[PDB]
Every structure is written in structure tokens, then in C-alpha cells.
Amino acid sequence: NNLDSNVSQIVLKKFLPGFMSDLVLAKTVDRQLLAGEINSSTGDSVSFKRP
Amino acid sequence: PNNLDSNVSQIVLKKFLPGFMSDLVLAKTVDRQLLAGEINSSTGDSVSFKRP
């Protein structure tokens, strides 16, 4: 009868897994042309020529 | 309050973007050796080949 004070409420130190997404578009778009071209001197924007 | 747009310059890089084009198969397939070099100064503007 009334043994509640003997036991204690415990929370385990385990995190349940969640939801994750995948990334494929960032690895396919071109990144070599616009690589470091925007500097302190260049400013806000940079431009490329057209054929 | 800061207005630093006159400390920089607008730069146009020296690179060209790709464009478009098409393939050529009709030029390669048709015959070219028969008519090559036959038309010259002494042949006017036409030359003929016989028939079987």
C-alpha cells in the first residue's frame, strides 16, 4: 500500500531517430565558374560574357 | 548609413558561355571525289558526265 515514494521516474539518455532528406541537386549544378569570383573588390555581383 | 558602393567596381570576367549547334551528316555521306577539281578556268561553269 502506497509504495510510490520508493521508486523514481527515470528518463533514458537515448534519442529516437528522426526524419532526414537527401541532397543531389547541389552536386550536379556547375560550381567551377562561380568560385571565389565575388571578392571584396568585385562587390555585390559579377558577370560573364555571352557568345 | 554606410554607403560604400563607390569603393568597388563592376567586373565583367573574360569567360564565354556555351551556345548551340547542329551535326553534319549529309555533307559527309554524299559523293565528293567525282566533282573535285574538275571545274576550273578552262571548263566554264559546268561539266558533264556520260550515261550508261
Distance from CA of B25 to the nearest CA of A (A): 25
**Pair A38, B5: CB distance under 8 Å:** no
CA distance linking residue B37 with residue B35, whole number of Å: 6
The DSSP secondary structure of A23-49, one letter per residue, reads: --STTTS--STTSS-S-TTT-S--EEE
Which residues are bridge partners to B16 per DSSP? A49
Report the b/e string of A14-36 with b at 16+ CB within 10 A. Answer: eeeeeeeeeeeeeeeeeeeeeee
Other beta carbons less than 10 A from residue B10's beta carbon? 10
* Specified resolution (Å): 3.7
Nearest by CB to B8, from A41, A49, A51: name it. Answer: A41
Type of residue found at A5: S
Handedness of CA A25, A44, A41, B9 (dihedral sign): positive
Phi, psi of B26 (to 5 degrees): -70, -35
Contact B11 A42 (CB under 8 A): yes
Experimental approach was cryo-EM
For residue A8, count CB atoms less than 10 angstroms from its CB and return exposed for 0-12, middle for 13-18, buried for 19 or more: exposed
Indicate the length of chain A as a whole number.
51
